[PDB]
């Protein structure tokens, strides 16, 4: 990938392995990145005490 | 803007309805108010203020107290009528069930929605319904949707007549004024008859005391609903404001002047036309209301029913679009010259339906010989009066002293205009309009902001000039 | 030139060089050449907004809350109130049974 | 503070001056701790907007030995437990044993 | 959590794009139900941020070079006019917006 | 006398602005303005940014998932009335800026 | 999570020799490693999945183009690339063929596959009235069309058509430009605007399938809705209703003659 | 006993013939506040006549 | 202040407190209503397995309405006193 | 530039460094090394 | 005059935010505590979430016993 990456920056080659990847991080079991994206469909907050016509207290 | 307005150089009536029957009964005292055929009453001004105000206190004798509701299954009398001028004059509030289907399920349902004093109904209802794919007119026996109703009747114990609770399961039930026609001469004996005539008391009629006190924006009316809004608005409420002035609202395009005889098709006395629009029309403004056949559904008095427009001389008749296809099936027996005293028909359409096509307004004209026709469109809140339309010159004034903007959902008193061609709630202002609208939980409101204007809650949209076309309830 | 924060002095210390950069040396400048009639040249403060905001008199929220609430609390008395007269019937000929 | 359930950010208050309690010792810069004073005097607002940290150093600043670089041995004021005793106590920062390799004098 | 207003000047690292980017008012996690720790770290929090992003990387995307990266210089607003009053009219076509 | 010349000056707070300063009963000096520009809506604003100095979408309805399944679920939380798909917090603060006449006369 | 079998205890060597509560089990510093590295020896089994997060959004119309649905794309990303089109176009569809004989018609093919990736997917995010799938044909089609849909119902074609020498790394960009002309054209084009604006303003969302890894924002919906808060700095809007002062117009420059002078 | 509403007796509380003819929808003491209003007009619509 | 519970007078039983006595007798018609009700030894002692009810006016509403008995403690008009939709035997 | 307190205040932080340092694992070729060719449906075996 | 109409009064279908016999209700002002504001559901809680604070003032809310209070 990289080859056709780097004539779309119009630089050479080997520069691009610096544009790129700017640091090797790399992974272990003691420092991995979030496993699982974060869930997007969050549950939906509700009166307190399952109140139904809103809720006047917190 | 999505904004549309009337002009506002048309005077307002305010008053009670028990007021703008005094001053008619002394500036126009013996001329007809209402003429019918199918009851033999020649009405003048002098009789609805003497037969209200001697039925009003026929109520009061038989338990009915002001803020009580009660209920009417009346089909398309002229009793009919001075109920609600009774029920105005003590402010209990008149509920106008369509008789037009009825059955003891859907009596066991008003009985427990509006909870009456009084039940208003008779023994026989003409009831329509199709045999052979053809409308035919069957006379319903009324008397056996109240037994089955009412199990306590048929279950009569010598001390019956004087229990607390007639019916334990509707202890609201007071009296069921029975409404039959009757030929015997000796009439009913005063065990079974509340008395109408008479002065009803000794220093001072108690009505013009007791209609000091109610206010002429509270409710008199409680006429039912073909397509509600949504789930909550079961019956629409009007007061006395909203709907003396359907009337000289009404009563003021058609310019009814004295000496007016202007028809109704019957079947009508369920929605607004024939409960406000018709008559207060014909009350407020000196003019004559003659209903026509008792009835209209059915193709064999269609025939019959032109017959009683033409000898009782009528200068123009309401009534929806569904009552003049059965002119007009007919209007062919009958020669040009039988609506010589026409000159216009009135189409109350509903603010939903659709536009009824000038081809078929061409159609009416074209049969009926009128100088115009005048289409008045708009929900059955507003009285069905926002737009009207006439047939030559098509274009639609919104009536006079009526505003409709439509707003954004968000606030209510600050909501704001939205861009004419979005829909969403929308906000009517009138006289005629009303706000408030029965239900099971009882008399209820709608919201009336800080500026006079009353959300129907019914989601429209407004475009370019007059034109309010209504929607249903968004539900993404 | 942006307003400096509370817990920065404000004091112009006069006309001097760059005194343009001298926020309060800036629009007090340009304050007298209102009073002495100058034409100001150069741009206005240029108060930046989002895609959400909202006006100032804007459209409130609360009492449009409770005057739903209510219809929510109406709308369901409403339905729960079918054959309300039929049902407290035959509460009581059970209650008169015990 | 605002009730909504989403709230996207805007250039200024969306409905007015924040309200609240809370809302009125962020309007005035103080931390939102100022609202478990019971006397709030002009110099407590002084005293809490931090306009400079009551915060020394262990021994003086030339005699100063390890190397702290931009700490103080600040105060916490704690409330105590269940019956709410104000206490207060010198927090430290955590010095540790540098052992460094300064490659300039090629030793650790 | 940020009360006030105020617009910083990002300068970007690979493009020096001076792109300025603003800080809305997102108001207070709620003080009904209080919660120590999402409060006092999100006032301490805000001094970093309004003394122009003392302990955070910016992560902002470019306009000259779209894309988002971390590389962005938060230049005060007197050390920006020294820059933009130092760029002759074109560059500032490049740089400037 | 020690404001040479007209120094603008803000619109009162939004409570004023509900009771007096738009209100026509008073005759107040915004009933004017109010009625003439402000009340009417931006003219690409839909049904739900009615509000919004300028419609923050290109399209009324919600915009993402979450602005979605939230008023999916707030419209039927609310029985479904008309207006209820716009989402409103559950709890009222019971502030006194927030408080216009309930009742009154118009 | 299927990795959520953390034993609760751990090797290390229990600090603080005397005794006490809370000794010997796990810390949420090793509750995260053997959550990792039991995610790995899944990740070999390939019984790990990634739809765990995802599991509301409805899970999009698989086809043999359309894996540009599957993928998990990373919000940073979906940032960047922020195409917008004409609103009332209500879908995209790129379909492309499976294996191009002529050298050319691998070319566009290529551009294709890469504009059925790159560019299809923000537009979803980004626009959310428009439907965009991609279907792979299989034949030897040496040319893939667009079916660009409006509102309206009527559609176009944007014959996918790269140059020779470009590459594919801009073939794209060219027919995005060929897109993003067409949507606006075509929504220019169109009639009678009062019914489009009904039903724009009520297309339900189509971009629910997306799969957005959202990477440093996920602490609260406010972030989550990051790219639609768009600053607009310098806001203009020069149209004011202005309220000239009619009575006593005048008046102003006519009065205080300052200390009457030696006439008066 | 353990009622709350005791049958209208003899005592000069609000407007019971308006607290009948008003609507349920609204809260109490917006309409204790509106059958005034209401009662308040229908004390002027009784000194004009 | 300790002295926590009182001595002087402890009443042999007491009414308000026995496992059910106190029972909020709140509205079926879901109006959030409540008339706190101690029942009487008729229903005391559980000659009652059903739970108590009866005919009370509801102030909201102003009509008698079922009064269905439940503890006193508790929202009174949680997400489970909403009422099914039903289309009514009236409209078209 | 910045120290995180907090773990979750670094698993974001990994998050940023992530993209900015190793970027090549955030391009739509990367995205789709499953798919450069045929889904693994419709190949031989 | 101008025949403009106008209802006289406006019916909103809210309801009260103060009833008498609830303790916290009312109207409270735009910088009073909210309705049981830093409680967080509990009893004067407002005193337990205060060793949770970072730090408090120098005089912050300390003990106090109502004598003659
Ligand atoms: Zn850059």
Redesign the pocket.
């Known amino acids: 990938v990289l080859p056709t990456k780097a004539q779309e920056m119009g630089c050479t080659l080997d520069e691009a392995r610096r544009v790129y990847r700017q640091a090797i991080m790399t992974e272990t079991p003691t420092w991995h990145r979030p496993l699982q994206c974060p869930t997007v469909k969050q549950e939906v907050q509700e009166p307190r005490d399952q109140r139904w016509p809103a809720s006047p207290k917190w | 803007y999505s904004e549309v307005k009337g002009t506002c150089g048309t005077p307002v009536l305010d008053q009670l309805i028990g007021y703008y029957v005094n001053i008619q009964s002394r500036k126009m005292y013996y001329k007809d108010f209402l003429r019918i055929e199918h009851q033999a009453v020649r009405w003048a001004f002098a009789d609805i203020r003497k037969n209200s105000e001697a039925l009003a206190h026929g109520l009061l004798q038989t338990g009915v107290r002001p803020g009580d509701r009660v209920l009417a299954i009346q089909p398309c009398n002229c009793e009919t009528f001075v109920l609600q001028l009774s029920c105005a004059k003590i402010g209990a509030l008149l509920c106008i069930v369509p008789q037009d289907t009825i059955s003891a399920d859907k009596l066991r349902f008003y009985l427990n929605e509006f909870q009456p004093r009084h039940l208003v109904a008779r023994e026989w209802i003409n009831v329509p319904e199709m045999k052979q794919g053809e409308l035919v007119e069957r006379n319903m026996h009324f008397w056996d949707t109240i037994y089955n109703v009412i199990p306590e009747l048929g279950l009569s114990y010598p001390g019956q007549k004087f229990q607390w609770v007639h019916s334990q399961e509707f202890y609201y039930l007071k009296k069921i004024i029975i409404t039959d026609h009757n030929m015997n001469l000796l009439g009913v004996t005063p065990m079974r008859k509340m008395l109408v005539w008479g002065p009803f008391s000794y220093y001072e009629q108690r009505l013009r005391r007791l209609s000091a006190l109610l206010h002429p924006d509270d409710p008199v009316l409680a006429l039912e609903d073909p397509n509600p809004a949504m789930e909550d608005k079961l019956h629409i409420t009007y007061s006395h404001r909203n709907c003396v002035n359907a009337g000289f609202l009404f009563g003021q395009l058609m310019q009814l002047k004295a000496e007016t005889r202007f028809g109704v098709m019957p079947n009508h006395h369920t929605d607004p036309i024939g409960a406000i629009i018709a008559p207060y029309a014909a009350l407020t403004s000196g003019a004559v209301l003659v209903h026509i056949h008792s009835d209209m559904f059915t193709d064999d008095h269609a025939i019959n029913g032109i017959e009683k427009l033409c000898v009782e001389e009528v200068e123009t008749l309401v009534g929806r679009k569904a009552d003049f296809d059965l002119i007009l099936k007919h209007a062919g027996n009958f020669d040009a010259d039988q609506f010589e005293h026409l000159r216009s028909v009135v189409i109350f359409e509903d603010g939903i339906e659709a536009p009824v096509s000038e081809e078929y307004l061409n159609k009416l004209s074209k049969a009926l010989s009128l100088d115009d026709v005048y289409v008045f469109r708009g929900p059955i809140e507003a009285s069905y009066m926002l737009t009207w339309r006439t047939l030559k010159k098509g274009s639609q004034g919104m009536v006079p002293h009526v505003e409709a903007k439509v707003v954004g959902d968000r606030g209510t008193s600050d909501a704001k205009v939205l861009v004419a061609g979005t829909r969403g709630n929308l906000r009517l202002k009138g006289p005629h309009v009303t706000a408030g609208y029965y239900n099971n939980a009882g008399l209820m409101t709608e919201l009336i902001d800080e500026h006079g204007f009353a959300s129907t809650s019914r989601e429209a949209m407004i475009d370019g000039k007059d034109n309010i076309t209504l929607m249903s309830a968004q539900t993404y | 030139v942006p307003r400096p924060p509370q817990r920065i002095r404000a004091q112009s210390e006069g006309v001097v060089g760059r005194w343009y950069t001298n926020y309060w040396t800036l629009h007090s400048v340009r304050y007298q050449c209102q009073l002495a009639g100058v034409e100001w040249q150069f741009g206005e403060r240029q108060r930046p907004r989002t895609n959400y905001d909202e006006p100032h008199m804007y459209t409130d929220f609360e009492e449009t809350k409770a005057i739903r609430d209510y219809r929510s609390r109406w709308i369901n008395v409403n339905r729960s109130l079918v054959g309300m007269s039929r049902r407290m019937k035959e509460s009581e000929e059970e209650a008169r049974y015990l | 503070f605002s009730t909504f359930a989403l709230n996207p950010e805007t250039s200024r208050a969306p409905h007015g001056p924040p309200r609240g309690l809370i809302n009125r010792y962020i309007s005035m810069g103080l931390p939102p701790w100022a609202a478990w004073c019971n006397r709030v005097n002009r110099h407590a607002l002084y005293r809490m907007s931090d306009v400079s940290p009551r915060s020394f150093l262990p021994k003086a600043p030339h005699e100063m030995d390890v190397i702290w670089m931009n700490e103080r041995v600040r105060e916490r004021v704690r409330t105590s437990r269940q019956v709410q005793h104000v206490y207060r106590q010198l927090k430290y920062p955590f010095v540790k044993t540098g052992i460094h390799y300064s490659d300039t004098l090629d030793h650790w | 959590s940020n009360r006030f207003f105020q617009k910083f000047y990002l300068r970007?690292?690979?493009?020096?794009?001076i792109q300025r980017s603003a800080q809305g008012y997102q108001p207070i996690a709620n003080p009904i139900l209080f919660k120590s720790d999402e409060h006092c770290r999100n006032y301490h929090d805000e001094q970093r941020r309004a003394a122009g992003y003392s302990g955070m990387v910016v992560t902002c995307r470019?306009?000259?070079?779209e894309?988002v990266?971390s590389?962005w210089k938060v230049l005060d607003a007197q050390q920006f006019l020294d820059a933009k009053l130092r760029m002759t009219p074109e560059e500032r076509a490049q740089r400037l917006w | 006398e020690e404001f040479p010349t007209f120094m603008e000056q803000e619109l009162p707070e939004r409570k004023g602005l509900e009771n007096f300063a738009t209100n026509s009963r008073k005759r107040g000096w915004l009933a004017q303005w109010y009625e003439d520009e402000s009340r009417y809506a931006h003219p690409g604003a839909g049904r739900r940014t009615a509000h919004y100095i300028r419609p923050p979408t290109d399209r009324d309805f919600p915009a993402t998932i979450e602005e979605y399944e939230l008023a999916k679920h707030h419209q039927k939380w609310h029985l479904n009335q008309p207006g209820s798909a716009t989402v409103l917090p559950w709890h009222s603060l019971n502030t006194a800026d927030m408080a216009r006449r309930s009742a009154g006369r118009l | 999570e299927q990795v959520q079998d953390v034993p609760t205890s751990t090797d290390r060597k229990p600090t603080g020799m005397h005794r006490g509560p809370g000794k010997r089990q796990t810390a949420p510093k090793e509750a995260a490693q053997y959550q990792f590295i039991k995610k790995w020896d899944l990740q070999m089994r390939e019984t790990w999945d990634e739809l765990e997060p995802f599991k509301g959004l409805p899970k999009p119309k698989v086809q043999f183009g359309n894996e540009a649905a599957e993928v998990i794309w990373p919000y940073a990303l979906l940032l960047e690339n922020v195409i917008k089109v004409h609103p009332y176009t209500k879908s995209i569809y790129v379909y492309y063929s499976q294996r191009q004989s002529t050298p050319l018609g691998e070319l566009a093919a290529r551009v294709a596959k890469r504009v059925s990736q790159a560019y299809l997917i923000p537009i979803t995010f980004h626009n959310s009235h428009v439907y965009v799938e991609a279907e792979m044909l299989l034949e030897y089609s040496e040319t893939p069309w667009v079916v660009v849909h409006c509102l309206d119902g009527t559609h176009k074609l944007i014959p996918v058509k790269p140059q020779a020498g470009q590459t594919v790394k801009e073939g794209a960009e060219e027919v995005l430009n060929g897109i993003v002309s067409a949507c606006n054209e075509i929504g220019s084009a169109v009639k009678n605007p009062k019914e489009v604006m009904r039903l724009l303003s009520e297309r339900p969302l189509q971009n629910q399938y997306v799969r957005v890894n959202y990477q440093w924002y996920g602490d609260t919906p406010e972030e989550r809705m990051s790219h639609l808060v768009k600053w607009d700095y310098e806001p203009e809007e020069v149209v004011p209703q202005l309220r000239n002062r009619t009575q006593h117009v005048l008046d102003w420059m006519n009065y205080d003659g300052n200390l009457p002078t030696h006439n008066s | 006993h353990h009622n709350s509403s005791l049958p209208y007796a003899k005592h000069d509380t609000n407007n019971v013939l308006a607290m009948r003819l008003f609507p349920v929808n609204v809260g109490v003491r917006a309409r204790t506040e509106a059958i005034r209003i209401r009662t308040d007009d229908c004390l002027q619509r009784l000194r004009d006549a | 202040r300790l002295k926590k519970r009182m001595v002087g007078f402890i009443p042999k039983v007491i009414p308000r407190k026995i496992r059910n006595n106190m029972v909020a007798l709140r509205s079926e018609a879901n109006t959030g209503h409540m008339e706190g009700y101690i029942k009487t030894e008729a229903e005391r002692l559980d000659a009652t397995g059903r739970k108590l009810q009866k005919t009370m006016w509801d102030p909201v509403l102003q009509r008698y309405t079922l009064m269905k008995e439940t503890k006193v403690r508790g929202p009174f008009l949680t997400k489970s006193n909403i009422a099914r939709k039903v289309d009514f035997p009236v409209g078209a | 530039e910045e120290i995180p307190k907090t773990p979750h205040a670094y698993k974001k932080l990994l998050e940023k460094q992530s993209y900015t340092e190793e970027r090549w694992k955030y391009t739509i070729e990367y995205l789709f090394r499953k798919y450069e060719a045929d889904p693994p449906e419709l190949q031989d075996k | 005059a101008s025949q403009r109409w106008l209802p006289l009064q406006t019916l909103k279908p809210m309801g009260h935010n103060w009833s008498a016999a609830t303790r916290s209700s009312g109207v409270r002002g735009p910088h009073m505590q909210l309705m049981q504001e830093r409680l967080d559901q509990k009893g004067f809680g407002w005193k337990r979430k205060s060793r949770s604070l970072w730090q408090q003032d120098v005089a912050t809310a300390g003990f106090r016993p109502h004598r003659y209070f």
Do not use: K, L, Y
């Open positions: 970007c690292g690979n493009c020096s794009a470019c306009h000259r070079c894309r990266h590389n």
